[PDB]
Amino acid sequence: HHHGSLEIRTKVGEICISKVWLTDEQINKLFDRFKGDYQVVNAECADKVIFATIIAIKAVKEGRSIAKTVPGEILVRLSGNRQIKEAIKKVGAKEGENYIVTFGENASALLQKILSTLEIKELELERCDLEYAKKAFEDIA
Ligand SMILES: [Mg+2]
16 A cells, blocks of 8 residues: 555464364363364365464454454354354354364464364365355455
């Protein structure tokens, strides 16, 4: 824009993700034990989780987020529901296949820590097909 302005950063830092199997039992222990820079979501494929996480990190940083924390804002952005309670219903962790995403300075170690400590089984990361990725992008960006 105007000559002399920043300098506006596109990068949000490292984001790590794994598709996992979680029992209700594992989901309980996860939320009780871990309080940091992660979220667990029930999503169709990985790309949309990454899009939601990027937007959530940026919106929080810019003070333009709907929810007040990144984990809350991931749920809002991934679901498209401004009400956190409604977002949780749609894309919150559910017994079965989930994605764990971590972000911030120690993203990779945190993801490893969650996975290792809870002996969580990883599944093949599933990419969104291009049709879905197009839709997810228009929905989120
Ligand atoms: Mg599901």
